[model samples]
Target: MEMEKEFEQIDKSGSWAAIYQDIRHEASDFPSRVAKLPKNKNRNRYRDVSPFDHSRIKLHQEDNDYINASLIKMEEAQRSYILTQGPLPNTVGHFWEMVWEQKSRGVVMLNRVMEKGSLKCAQYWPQKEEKEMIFEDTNLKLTLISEDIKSYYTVRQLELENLTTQETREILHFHYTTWPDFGVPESPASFLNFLFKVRESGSLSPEHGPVVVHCSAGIGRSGTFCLADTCLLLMDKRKDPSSVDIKKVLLEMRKFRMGLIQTADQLRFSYLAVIEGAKFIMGD
Candidate 1:
């Protein structure tokens, strides 16, 4: 089936509205666990951001605080991901703390350092010239060993070290720079190319811990990346391109994080991307 023809069946002319309504209904029943968290207001990077208590990622080292991050586990698909917000000035250490504690092998960054001349995310990683940068709050150090710069993305090999124990581990940093804030990529071809780059590293496999995926808020673009990747995986596993339900998968993902796929356009693009990806995987 051609991608455009598949899109027509799921577009506005089809059942897109109905699917979106059902997803909203599913989200409405999720409990607002923000009030129950001890440091809900204190630790949030943005006043508007807070993880639902039901799916929040808790830290073993921090006894009284929390970070705006969640563990999204889709066991049936054998995929696990840590959905988190861009590190705040105060939360940079906590962010690395989560990475260390989770033992993640890769960090997928989907936002640029600045958007529209405003700071969207902190310069969390060391620059090309710098050798090592230390996070004083968490006593963690990150050393940049090498960097591969691409037109739309950059891949870095970083060494994470514990100041206390002097233990070190290598981590892969995959940054997709061209994706505009609150918008979809230019095309799925570029996006999927980057996705395959990360996949080829063996970071997304179950042998390693979950890959940490984040954008500015960790929902819109972040959610879209995960959804497209998950859908493509499902398509490959099922041996039937039409078997995966994109709406149901998004709803399931939103249970772990609120306000995923912020706009109708993003949701629409997700279907387009999934269909296009299925063609690549199936070699159609």
Candidate 2:
């Protein structure tokens, strides 16, 4: 599926340097005692499984996440994780290669707050500007690199509130399928078309790098879509077992990939929608 990367123009080279510097400063030359790292003071429950290992990126999936996740590491820097967030860092060496190839250009594309209407907003945010295009501090900001060079597109500032109009909705529908109502539509065919719209809009390609996605915690709707999409990608190689219902098998596969597929209320909508998405073909 052809996904539309809304925010593009990632300086693959420069960002690599920043990541390297960040990691170098963050990662220790010798492994330190893992047990005694500073306690993430934000939240408790999520802190338990918080991805921050003092190694790579840390994630706050649930519970008292804000407090416990005091230190930040790149979440799942190199994992071929099916889920938006991952438990183990990837074996694929995605993060390291990026740093090794660090250059002097590229923009950060994060779904979290910070992209403002003006340069002043970008500078005045709580985080410090690491450079012309980099924000050093922000809890929700995530960075990524795409394998495909051609996928690198320039970045533009788009507002979420601005997208809440009928015209925007239609435009979004034309470019990337849409669901007027949050609930999953009954027609499986339309669902599939919607799925492709979302994927082709951005979810399908690793080359497009990270696209801005959001909800309250990013784990609810954000998690479900990422989980389902990742599942589809993983399942792309395997045969669709005819013995069982395709939807049932596919959903099961998604849950297995990320134990919490649609665990949240908002996620249920995404789950139902994607299920409908699967049966859709281009012209359906």
Candidate 3:
């Protein structure tokens, strides 16, 4: 009951900010040997952002195993998610290759394009008139087959083809259209509803390989999405559905990827999303 009691106290007392500082505390000295390699420098979107070698994803390629993506497994929720940054132009092929090699059913993208005054993410996928993009480096082609747009998100149906094998796979591109990069999602109800749409695709299920979830840097909103998800899953699985320590869940997640849920606001909104999800689970 500490989790619920603490949440009530934080909500009423407005002390969530104080609690968030400790929740996000992490040392800066973790080793990211692979990502920091001389040859791999160009592939990273941000100089300071790199995956720790321990949990980073390795491609099936030789001497080319580096990708700024982390494989995160949450046993309590029975979920495997890949937390990664938006693709660098050079790494777009690598990004698709990771998704293909990992056999992930769909990609859960939290935000798009710009942030601050700089570019947050490359438009890795095809734009409207283009309709399809071919990555010659990875020898992969992505053709947009269908798409539907709603208020806060869009679902794109893409056909992924491997040039060598001439084999094709259907991949859903789940984009949270309205979310601001590095900013909090204003509506947890909408955020949870978007998560529901993702689950409906069965992309996050155990049957698929890990789900690729990313925002611009992949740490902030990506972590927020996954945190809310794993916590919701934990709540459903527990005999008592009311007591998941959100901070503890994020701590477990940070073991796989660093700097998840960046601001106190992200942590704040996290509670709202979880509480909202629980209402649906409780069917009320």
Candidate 4:
């Protein structure tokens, strides 16, 4: 329990204390040199959050596969997730290209196109069923074929094609529209319910490449979802709820991507979601 000694003084449950600030302070730094490259500059959405060079996904095309994404694998849980920023207007092609190359079957989007008055993310995919968006840069064509809209979220079925091969695959788009940037969801039940739907689809399973997950900067909401699901998975497998360490688990996740679980508030929400979701997994 190497993580035990470091976070011994920090609170892993309940409302965060000074440890909240401590956790964010400790979570303050990681290497992301490639994110600073002039050519890659346009691809990033925020100045502070960047993908670590070592774990960042690489594009096969040699045009440079530098999307603001990171591949995090948790062997103990038999799960892996690709955490990344929402595609920028110029990087939409790169976004789809990574999805295609990675063989991902689902995309869990946690943010909306606009939040409060600012454009949080670019509308990367075609919003309407009859419309088609062909990404000339990546030589990929994508279409939105079906959709089901909910008050808090929307479920969209999209078809992605590799123009060169003419082969295509359907991608499940789970968009949680109600969650605002830097704010927690209304309840853990809402988030857990959606996660269960995603789990049922088997997209997060190892059989698929990895589920592509993103929000605005791909740190706050994205990490919250990833942490909640991963934490829930760990609990189900270990069968001992107390065995899971929320703070420690996040540190490991941060190694692959910087500033995960952005604020103390988000960390607290992650804890809340895990504990509440565990009830359904473990039962009374």
Per-model TM-score, in order, reads: 0.91, 0.35, 0.94, 0.91
Clashing residue pairs in all predictions, respectively, total 0, 34, 0, 1
Which of candidates 2 and 4 is the stronger one according to lDDT? 4
lDDT of 2 by residue, 195-260 (tens): 455555543345433332322222333444444454444334335412222234334333222222
How does each model score on lDDT?
0.82, 0.28, 0.85, 0.83
As for candidate 3, its clashing pairs are none
- Ten-residue stretch with the least lDDT total in model 1: 28-37
Model 4 bad stretches (over 4 Å): 1-17, 28-30
Q: Which structure among the candidates has the greatest TM-score?
A: 3
> Cα lDDT for residue 41, model 4?
79
Alpha carbon lDDT at 132, candidate 2: 21
Q: How far is candidate 1 from the true structure (C-alpha RMSD, Å)?
A: 2.5
**Highest lDDT model number:** 3
Pairing residues by index, what is the TM-score of model 1?
0.91
What TM-score would you give candidate 2 relative to the actual structure?
A: 0.35
Better of 1 and 3 by lDDT: 3
